[PDB]
Write an enzyme that holds these catalytic residues in place. Structure first.
Site, PDB file in Angstrom:
ATOM      1  N   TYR A  87       0.629  -1.105   0.139  1.00 38.65           N
ATOM      2  CA  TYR A  87      -0.060   0.004  -0.232  1.00 38.65           C
ATOM      3  C   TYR A  87       1.197   1.081   0.124  1.00 38.65           C
ATOM      4  O   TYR A  87       1.736   1.403   0.669  1.00 38.65           O
ATOM      5  CB  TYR A  87      -0.976  -0.257   0.829  1.00 38.65           C
ATOM      6  CG  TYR A  87      -1.433   1.050   1.649  1.00 38.65           C
ATOM      7  CD1 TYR A  87      -2.509   1.865   0.646  1.00 38.65           C
ATOM      8  CD2 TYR A  87      -0.995   1.901   2.801  1.00 38.65           C
ATOM      9  CE1 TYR A  87      -2.512   3.264   1.888  1.00 38.65           C
ATOM     10  CE2 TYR A  87      -0.913   3.303   3.489  1.00 38.65           C
ATOM     11  CZ  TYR A  87      -1.961   3.651   2.687  1.00 38.65           C
ATOM     12  OH  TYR A  87      -2.867   5.078   2.999  1.00 38.65           O
ATOM     13  N   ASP A 131       4.538  -0.126 -20.664  1.00 35.46           N
ATOM     14  CA  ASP A 131       3.576   0.421 -19.728  1.00 35.46           C
ATOM     15  C   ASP A 131       3.773   1.458 -18.706  1.00 35.46           C
ATOM     16  O   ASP A 131       2.860   1.284 -17.531  1.00 35.46           O
ATOM     17  CB  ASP A 131       2.904   0.068 -19.575  1.00 35.46           C
ATOM     18  CG  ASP A 131       1.147   0.682 -19.357  1.00 35.46           C
ATOM     19  OD1 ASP A 131       0.656   1.358 -20.672  1.00 35.46           O
ATOM     20  OD2 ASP A 131      -0.351   0.267 -19.003  1.00 35.46           O
ATOM     21  N   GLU A 135      -0.440   6.763 -13.720  1.00 34.82           N
ATOM     22  CA  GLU A 135      -1.472   6.322 -12.984  1.00 34.82           C
ATOM     23  C   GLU A 135      -1.546   5.234 -12.801  1.00 34.82           C
ATOM     24  O   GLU A 135      -1.139   4.432 -11.698  1.00 34.82           O
ATOM     25  CB  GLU A 135      -2.791   6.050 -14.280  1.00 34.82           C
ATOM     26  CG  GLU A 135      -2.166   5.660 -15.456  1.00 34.82           C
ATOM     27  CD  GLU A 135      -2.457   7.643 -16.587  1.00 34.82           C
ATOM     28  OE1 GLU A 135      -1.452   7.761 -16.386  1.00 34.82           O
ATOM     29  OE2 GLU A 135      -3.896   7.536 -17.102  1.00 34.82           O
ATOM     30  N   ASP A 149       1.983  -2.400 -11.834  1.00 33.87           N
ATOM     31  CA  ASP A 149       0.655  -2.166 -13.043  1.00 33.87           C
ATOM     32  C   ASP A 149       1.151  -2.924 -13.397  1.00 33.87           C
ATOM     33  O   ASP A 149       1.530  -2.146 -15.112  1.00 33.87           O
ATOM     34  CB  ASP A 149      -0.127  -0.871 -13.033  1.00 33.87           C
ATOM     35  CG  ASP A 149      -1.031  -0.788 -12.449  1.00 33.87           C
ATOM     36  OD1 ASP A 149      -1.239  -0.893 -10.930  1.00 33.87           O
ATOM     37  OD2 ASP A 149      -2.040  -0.302 -12.575  1.00 33.87           O
TER      38      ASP A 149
HETATM   39  N1  ADN Z   1      -1.134   0.337  -3.299  1.00 34.58           N
HETATM   40  C1  ADN Z   1      -1.834   0.775  -4.084  1.00 34.58           C
HETATM   41  N2  ADN Z   1      -2.250   1.685  -3.026  1.00 34.58           N
HETATM   42  C2  ADN Z   1      -2.641   2.908  -3.487  1.00 34.58           C
HETATM   43  N3  ADN Z   1      -3.767   3.093  -4.374  1.00 34.58           N
HETATM   44  C3  ADN Z   1      -3.367   2.167  -5.624  1.00 34.58           C
HETATM   45  C4  ADN Z   1      -2.786   0.648  -4.724  1.00 34.58           C
HETATM   46  N4  ADN Z   1      -2.878  -0.530  -5.653  1.00 34.58           N
HETATM   47  C5  ADN Z   1      -3.418   0.111  -6.448  1.00 34.58           C
HETATM   48  N5  ADN Z   1      -3.704   1.634  -7.571  1.00 34.58           N
HETATM   49  C6  ADN Z   1      -4.947   1.920  -7.959  1.00 34.58           C
HETATM   50  O1  ADN Z   1      -5.257   1.165  -8.303  1.00 34.58           O
HETATM   51  C7  ADN Z   1      -4.885   1.362  -9.652  1.00 34.58           C
HETATM   52  C8  ADN Z   1      -5.563   0.349 -10.361  1.00 34.58           C
HETATM   53  O2  ADN Z   1      -3.999  -0.575 -10.969  1.00 34.58           O
HETATM   54  C9  ADN Z   1      -4.333   1.915  -9.885  1.00 34.58           C
HETATM   55  O3  ADN Z   1      -3.915   2.808 -11.095  1.00 34.58           O
HETATM   56  C10 ADN Z   1      -3.936   3.037  -8.779  1.00 34.58           C
HETATM   57  O4  ADN Z   1      -4.661   4.157  -8.901  1.00 34.58           O
END
Ligand code: ADN
Length: 265
Positions: A87, A131, A135, A149
């Site tokens: 997180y 990629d 985001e 991601d």
């Molecule tokens: N560990 C994380 N902490 C905060 N936001 C996250 C986390 N993992 C994914 N996200 C959010 O969810 C979206 C989908 O992966 C990301 O683009 C990001 O905005």
């Protein structure tokens, strides 16, 4: 090693994605706080991502870096897919860019250095992300950038393709359908650096078709405020020829990067 939903308490949603939603979660046993990303199998199947998911989970699990988001584990609901992720308290770079409109040179340089370090490690281990967009970039409590991601990430050199999504961060070679190598990430670095300083992607357009031309032509311009040191690094990274693109080490040792970067190469 094997997890189930019952082991977690679910919090507020961190993020939403077409495929799934990401939730803040706490592991009951340890009180560990982590992000839980939830994907229904059904949404997943329609696209041929089921193999894509396997690639993301494997690559991220075996990768350990300060600047790379950690994947702790995975498990499947009937039928749902659960990913246990590190997180990031400070959230997405994309969110930060919206709030600040543009990043200062010192902050921009630091993100690039952190990105470059993470990418060098990825490339060393034979992984190409392919990629990289704001985001997909997350911020640690210290505010350090963490790449995430990894789904589209693959081993290279490779031929893995444009049809589904926005082209802003894609290299000319990928959009044109030519086989690609680690240099793809160098291009992404160039696009990100521009977006950080300018507040918009270099090839951004109203139309997908128009963006395709801009990328293929590689026609972009600099606002007046962008410094010559910044322009030089961007121009070097954004090169139609992948071979002409500099190495990550070159990026790390670049004068503009060195001068403005808080964090050492
Ligand atoms: N560990 C994380 N902490 C905060 N936001 C996250 C986390 N993992 C994914 N996200 C959010 O969810 C979206 C989908 O992966 C990301 O683009 C990001 O905005």
């Amino acid at each position: 090693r094997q997890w189930a939903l019952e082991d977690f308490e679910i919090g507020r949603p961190l993020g939403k994605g077409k495929f799934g939603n990401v939730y803040l979660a706490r592991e009951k046993q340890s009180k560990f706080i982590l992000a839980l990303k939830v994907l229904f199998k059904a949404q997943l199947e329609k696209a041929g991502v089921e193999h894509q998911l396997r690639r993301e989970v494997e690559i991220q699990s075996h990768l350990r870096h300060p600047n790379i988001l950690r994947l702790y584990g995975y498990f499947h609901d009937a039928t749902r897919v659960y990913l246990i992720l590190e997180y990031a308290p400070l959230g997405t770079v994309y969110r930060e860019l919206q709030k600040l409109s543009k990043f200062d040179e010192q902050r921009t340089a630091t993100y690039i250095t952190e990105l470059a370090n993470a990418l060098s490690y990825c490339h060393s281990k034979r992984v190409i992300h392919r990629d990289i967009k704001p985001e997909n970039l997350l911020l640690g409590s210290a505010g350090e950038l963490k790449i995430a991601d990894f789904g589209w990430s693959v081993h290279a050199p490779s031929s893995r393709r444009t049809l589904c999504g926005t082209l802003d961060y894609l290299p000319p070679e990928m959009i044109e359908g030519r086989m690609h190598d680690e240099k793809v990430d160098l291009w992404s670095l160039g696009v990100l650096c521009y977006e950080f300083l300018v507040g918009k992607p270099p090839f951004e357009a109203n139309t997908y078709q128009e963006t395709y031309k801009r990328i293929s032509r590689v026609e972009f311009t600099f606002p007046d405020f962008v410094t010559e040191g910044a322009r030089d690094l961007i121009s070097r990274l954004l090169k139609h020829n992948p071979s002409q693109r500099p190495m990550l080490r070159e990026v790390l040792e670049h004068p503009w990067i060195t001068a403005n970067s808080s964090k050492p190469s």
